Design a binder for this molecule. Sequence first.
Ligand SMILES: NC(=O)C1=CN([C@@H]2O[C@H](COP(=O)(O)OP(=O)(O)OC[C@H]3O[C@@H](n4cnc5c(N)ncnc54)[C@H](OP(=O)(O)O)[C@@H]3O)[C@@H](O)[C@H]2O)C=CC1
Length: 329
Amino acid sequence: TVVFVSGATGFIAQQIVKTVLEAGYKTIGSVRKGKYLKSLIESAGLNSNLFNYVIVKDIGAKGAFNEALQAHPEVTVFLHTASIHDVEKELLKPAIEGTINALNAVTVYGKNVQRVVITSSYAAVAGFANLATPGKEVNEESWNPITYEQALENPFLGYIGSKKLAEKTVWNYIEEKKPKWDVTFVNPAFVLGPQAFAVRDKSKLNASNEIINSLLTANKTKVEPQQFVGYFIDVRDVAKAHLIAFEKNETVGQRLLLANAPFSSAGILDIIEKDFPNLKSELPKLDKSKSPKFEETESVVNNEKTRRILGFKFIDLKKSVDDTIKQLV
Ligand SMILES: NC(=O)C1=CN([C@@H]2O[C@H](COP(=O)(O)OP(=O)(O)OC[C@H]3O[C@@H](n4cnc5c(N)ncnc54)[C@H](OP(=O)(O)O)[C@@H]3O)[C@@H](O)[C@H]2O)C=CC1
């Protein structure tokens, strides 16, 4: 098998590129640095003859992957991973077009592709903010009731909208165009965990791991840490689920809800104080009033279907946080 991965230099994608190579599959990643990632795998001890790369400056531009799928027609898996606070220019339309630019380039040029795995999100599963359904039931088939108009009112709700709607463009495409490849959706919740190989900037991680990292850099930046609630998932569990999304035949047309257990910025902090006492002078005191309560925004995730299909045991929060902190010293 030959697995293509868009935006390979990303947080989840680097873990995706890693666990695939550990399964012996070939890999071909996209890059905006190609030697930054190839020097990373070989030095990591991985079996390093299963990876090359392509250069793609932008995903939201038309035909972004055509010359990538016209230089290598051998690919048979497409892992579309590349897709918070922005600048408030435009976040919705490039997110839906960036996906469409790939569904138009995988169909028009990549015909050796059989399975496509679109990395979506839990934001396309349950509602946020004014559409919060606290205490209510959500599962693989549930959908965020947010609309395009109700989105991009916030860099937060806009990201929530841009992720719920970009998955819709795949659902509309597979029926409007009726392609020859099969689709699978991996819907990761709040992804935590350590980098695939090596951290590059210890002061700022990805937007998701800053949930952990802000607790460390708070006393340096003198920034009161923004607290969060919701469901977490370890980046290694998401990486393993992306393989099952194309290696297994029962994941076809399934929205793999990649959520473990609830979490909280306060709950994550307690793990760091116990397992890393040398940091007790670097960890802050969280305000009990600034803390969002769980039973108020988040629904009840019913991913019983996904856990049964994945079949493996996920990484607990303690191991996820411990492995995360171990990298940043
Ligand atoms: N907690 C989480 O991590 C969550 C993850 N997800 C989804 O999973 C995916 C992985 O995100 P994650 O790894 O955590 O975050 P990162 O920011 O680390 O990943 C971003 C990736 O997308 C690429 N990219 C972004 N914008 C562009 C662009 N305009 N043109 C080309 N490439 C671009 C980046 O390439 P480069 O870095 O080289 O610029 C990078 O590889 C995302 O699509 C995210 O929405 C879903 C829900 C939550």
